[PDB]
PDB file of C-alpha atoms in Angstrom:
ATOM      1  CA  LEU A   1     103.753  84.904  86.898  1.00 57.66           C
ATOM      2  CA  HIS A   2     106.012  82.951  89.351  1.00 56.69           C
ATOM      3  CA  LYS A   3     106.948  82.186  93.151  1.00 54.45           C
ATOM      4  CA  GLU A   4     110.426  82.322  94.044  1.00 51.71           C
ATOM      5  CA  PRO A   5     111.630  81.491  97.735  1.00 54.79           C
ATOM      6  CA  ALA A   6     111.669  83.220 100.936  1.00 55.60           C
ATOM      7  CA  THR A   7     111.861  82.835 104.129  1.00 52.87           C
ATOM      8  CA  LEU A   8     110.607  85.001 107.014  1.00 52.67           C
ATOM      9  CA  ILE A   9     112.205  87.599 109.211  1.00 52.25           C
ATOM     10  CA  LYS A  10     109.596  89.714 110.673  1.00 50.35           C
ATOM     11  CA  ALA A  11     106.274  90.994 110.829  1.00 54.25           C
ATOM     12  CA  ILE A  12     105.679  94.334 110.674  1.00 53.80           C
ATOM     13  CA  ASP A  13     102.116  95.572 110.015  1.00 54.94           C
ATOM     14  CA  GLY A  14      99.174  93.738 108.759  1.00 55.15           C
ATOM     15  CA  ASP A  15     100.316  95.024 104.806  1.00 56.12           C
ATOM     16  CA  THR A  16     103.809  94.838 105.697  1.00 56.13           C
ATOM     17  CA  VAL A  17     106.480  91.963 106.414  1.00 55.09           C
ATOM     18  CA  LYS A  18     110.207  92.191 106.519  1.00 52.95           C
ATOM     19  CA  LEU A  19     111.664  89.103 104.235  1.00 50.77           C
ATOM     20  CA  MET A  20     115.410  87.720 102.999  1.00 51.26           C
ATOM     21  CA  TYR A  21     114.633  87.273  99.406  1.00 51.03           C
ATOM     22  CA  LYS A  22     118.015  85.794  97.624  1.00 53.50           C
ATOM     23  CA  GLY A  23     119.894  85.841 100.173  1.00 53.54           C
ATOM     24  CA  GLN A  24     119.587  90.181 101.460  1.00 54.07           C
ATOM     25  CA  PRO A  25     116.380  91.297 104.516  1.00 51.51           C
ATOM     26  CA  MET A  26     114.069  93.344 102.553  1.00 49.86           C
ATOM     27  CA  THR A  27     110.638  95.261 103.206  1.00 53.00           C
ATOM     28  CA  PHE A  28     107.896  93.745 101.734  1.00 52.38           C
ATOM     29  CA  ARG A  29     104.620  95.737 100.961  1.00 53.61           C
ATOM     30  CA  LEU A  30     101.943  94.189 100.452  1.00 50.97           C
ATOM     31  CA  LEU A  31     100.191  94.807  96.681  1.00 52.85           C
ATOM     32  CA  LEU A  32      96.628  95.269  96.180  1.00 54.82           C
ATOM     33  CA  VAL A  33      95.210  95.588  99.977  1.00 57.49           C
ATOM     34  CA  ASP A  34      94.978  98.532 102.230  1.00 61.99           C
ATOM     35  CA  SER A  35      95.225  97.401 105.819  1.00 60.50           C
ATOM     36  CA  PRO A  36      94.197  99.686 109.145  1.00 59.27           C
ATOM     37  CA  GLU A  37      98.053 100.382 110.681  1.00 61.72           C
ATOM     38  CA  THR A  38      99.653 100.406 114.009  1.00 63.54           C
ATOM     39  CA  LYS A  39     101.644 102.940 112.519  1.00 63.42           C
ATOM     40  CA  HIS A  40     101.347 106.447 111.523  1.00 63.53           C
ATOM     41  CA  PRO A  41     100.440 109.394 113.670  1.00 62.14           C
ATOM     42  CA  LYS A  42      98.609 110.559 110.763  1.00 61.95           C
ATOM     43  CA  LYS A  43      96.540 107.722 111.589  1.00 64.35           C
ATOM     44  CA  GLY A  44      97.525 106.113 114.716  1.00 62.94           C
ATOM     45  CA  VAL A  45      96.624 102.604 115.541  1.00 61.40           C
ATOM     46  CA  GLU A  46      93.134 102.610 113.062  1.00 65.50           C
ATOM     47  CA  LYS A  47      90.256  99.608 113.741  1.00 65.26           C
ATOM     48  CA  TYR A  48      91.099  96.776 113.126  1.00 66.62           C
ATOM     49  CA  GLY A  49      94.421  97.496 112.582  1.00 68.51           C
ATOM     50  CA  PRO A  50      96.645  95.621 115.866  1.00 66.75           C
ATOM     51  CA  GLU A  51      93.464  92.657 114.225  1.00 70.22           C
ATOM     52  CA  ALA A  52      94.907  93.297 110.496  1.00 68.80           C
ATOM     53  CA  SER A  53      97.809  92.731 111.969  1.00 68.99           C
ATOM     54  CA  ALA A  54      97.642  89.210 113.937  1.00 70.25           C
ATOM     55  CA  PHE A  55      96.260  87.927 111.027  1.00 71.91           C
ATOM     56  CA  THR A  56      99.225  88.796 109.542  1.00 69.57           C
ATOM     57  CA  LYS A  57     101.786  87.426 112.553  1.00 65.52           C
ATOM     58  CA  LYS A  58     100.592  84.241 112.594  1.00 68.24           C
ATOM     59  CA  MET A  59      99.844  83.884 109.280  1.00 69.23           C
ATOM     60  CA  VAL A  60     103.738  84.151 108.246  1.00 67.29           C
ATOM     61  CA  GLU A  61     104.822  82.626 111.610  1.00 67.91           C
ATOM     62  CA  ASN A  62     103.034  79.264 112.074  1.00 70.96           C
ATOM     63  CA  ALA A  63     104.230  78.600 107.870  1.00 72.69           C
ATOM     64  CA  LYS A  64     106.208  75.714 106.473  1.00 73.93           C
ATOM     65  CA  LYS A  65     106.823  77.442 102.914  1.00 75.24           C
ATOM     66  CA  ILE A  66     106.643  81.651 102.670  1.00 76.36           C
ATOM     67  CA  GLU A  67     107.045  82.160  98.961  1.00 72.91           C
ATOM     68  CA  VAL A  68     106.596  85.932  96.694  1.00 71.11           C
ATOM     69  CA  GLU A  69     105.147  86.447  92.982  1.00 71.98           C
ATOM     70  CA  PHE A  70     106.505  89.356  92.451  1.00 72.72           C
ATOM     71  CA  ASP A  71     103.775  91.894  89.523  1.00 73.40           C
ATOM     72  CA  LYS A  72     104.015  92.549  85.709  1.00 75.01           C
ATOM     73  CA  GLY A  73     105.230  96.277  86.956  1.00 77.33           C
ATOM     74  CA  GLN A  74     107.618  97.999  89.071  1.00 74.74           C
ATOM     75  CA  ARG A  75     108.723  95.743  92.241  1.00 77.64           C
ATOM     76  CA  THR A  76     109.783  98.384  93.865  1.00 79.19           C
ATOM     77  CA  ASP A  77     107.646 101.538  95.520  1.00 78.52           C
ATOM     78  CA  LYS A  78     109.608 104.841  96.379  1.00 78.41           C
ATOM     79  CA  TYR A  79     110.196 103.661  99.969  1.00 78.24           C
ATOM     80  CA  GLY A  80     112.732 100.748  98.448  1.00 75.71           C
ATOM     81  CA  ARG A  81     109.398  98.198  99.803  1.00 76.34           C
ATOM     82  CA  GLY A  82     109.594  94.939  97.711  1.00 75.41           C
ATOM     83  CA  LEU A  83     106.004  94.804  96.154  1.00 77.61           C
ATOM     84  CA  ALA A  84     104.146  91.498  95.908  1.00 75.68           C
ATOM     85  CA  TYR A  85     101.541  88.813  96.354  1.00 75.82           C
ATOM     86  CA  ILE A  86     103.071  86.943  99.771  1.00 76.26           C
ATOM     87  CA  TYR A  87     101.944  83.501 100.171  1.00 74.43           C
ATOM     88  CA  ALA A  88     102.427  80.900 103.174  1.00 74.05           C
ATOM     89  CA  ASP A  89     101.663  77.315 102.643  1.00 73.16           C
ATOM     90  CA  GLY A  90     100.240  78.028  99.747  1.00 73.97           C
ATOM     91  CA  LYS A  91      97.799  80.492 100.301  1.00 76.76           C
ATOM     92  CA  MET A  92      97.612  84.530  99.093  1.00 77.54           C
ATOM     93  CA  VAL A  93      97.707  86.087 102.042  1.00 76.93           C
ATOM     94  CA  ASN A  94      97.122  88.899 101.060  1.00 77.02           C
ATOM     95  CA  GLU A  95      93.266  87.553  99.596  1.00 75.42           C
ATOM     96  CA  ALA A  96      93.206  85.985 102.993  1.00 76.78           C
ATOM     97  CA  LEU A  97      93.515  89.967 104.511  1.00 77.46           C
ATOM     98  CA  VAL A  98      90.083  90.804 102.253  1.00 75.66           C
ATOM     99  CA  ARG A  99      88.310  87.631 102.460  1.00 78.88           C
ATOM    100  CA  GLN A 100      88.443  88.094 106.613  1.00 78.91           C
ATOM    101  CA  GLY A 101      86.796  91.243 105.946  1.00 75.15           C
ATOM    102  CA  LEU A 102      90.714  92.532 107.570  1.00 71.81           C
ATOM    103  CA  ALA A 103      91.572  95.161 104.495  1.00 72.56           C
ATOM    104  CA  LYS A 104      89.943  97.034 101.506  1.00 75.04           C
ATOM    105  CA  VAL A 105      91.923  96.793  97.622  1.00 73.08           C
ATOM    106  CA  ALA A 106      93.672  99.698  97.204  1.00 73.85           C
ATOM    107  CA  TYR A 107      93.462 101.868  94.357  1.00 72.38           C
ATOM    108  CA  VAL A 108      95.401 100.140  91.739  1.00 72.04           C
ATOM    109  CA  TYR A 109      98.068 101.063  89.458  1.00 72.89           C
ATOM    110  CA  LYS A 110      98.259  99.203  86.239  1.00 74.61           C
ATOM    111  CA  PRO A 111     100.402  96.672  85.074  1.00 75.33           C
ATOM    112  CA  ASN A 112     100.726  95.770  88.770  1.00 80.75           C
ATOM    113  CA  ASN A 113      97.527  94.465  88.652  1.00 81.05           C
ATOM    114  CA  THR A 114      96.919  90.480  87.729  1.00 81.82           C
ATOM    115  CA  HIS A 115      95.452  89.339  91.037  1.00 82.71           C
ATOM    116  CA  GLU A 116      92.764  93.043  90.887  1.00 81.03           C
ATOM    117  CA  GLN A 117      89.787  90.887  90.365  1.00 81.51           C
ATOM    118  CA  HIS A 118      90.119  87.235  92.179  1.00 81.09           C
ATOM    119  CA  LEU A 119      90.524  90.462  95.174  1.00 80.22           C
ATOM    120  CA  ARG A 120      87.498  92.150  94.127  1.00 79.51           C
ATOM    121  CA  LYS A 121      85.390  88.775  94.098  1.00 80.18           C
ATOM    122  CA  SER A 122      87.398  88.179  97.965  1.00 77.31           C
ATOM    123  CA  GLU A 123      86.362  91.310  98.813  1.00 76.74           C
ATOM    124  CA  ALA A 124      82.485  91.156  97.813  1.00 78.48           C
ATOM    125  CA  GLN A 125      81.999  88.040  99.468  1.00 75.29           C
ATOM    126  CA  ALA A 126      83.520  89.519 102.854  1.00 73.56           C
ATOM    127  CA  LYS A 127      81.400  92.529 102.776  1.00 74.40           C
ATOM    128  CA  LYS A 128      78.146  90.943 101.336  1.00 74.98           C
ATOM    129  CA  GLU A 129      78.764  88.378 105.081  1.00 73.68           C
ATOM    130  CA  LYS A 130      79.078  91.866 107.164  1.00 76.30           C
ATOM    131  CA  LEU A 131      83.083  90.577 108.430  1.00 74.62           C
ATOM    132  CA  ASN A 132      84.916  92.888 110.875  1.00 73.74           C
ATOM    133  CA  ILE A 133      85.844  96.725 108.718  1.00 73.11           C
ATOM    134  CA  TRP A 134      82.371  95.936 107.194  1.00 72.45           C
ATOM    135  CA  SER A 135      80.220  95.652 110.477  1.00 70.75           C
TER     136      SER A 135
END
């Protein structure tokens, strides 16, 4: 797997960010994580949704460098969003959310599952620490 440079355009949700990638504006969905949502009427503004959302936004907004890391599987989902691990100054946003109990680890579709074990490890610690979601 390799990291590629990208530029923040806009944070949209806890698990969704708009980036400039290879000169094109593109919406990325964060791989392997399920964040409470501020969007979708088939929920709405769920609990911790605004919290997960502010965490992703500060994290990408305050970074000097953002990088995208595609996994081994498909790189787009059916809605046209890129499927990636997103890094803010070397720190994986996907892992940070889960470590803070602000996301669960998603149902996982091989072969897009390289960092699966790492995140499950962070998710067990957040639950052990009874953080946010896990409170």
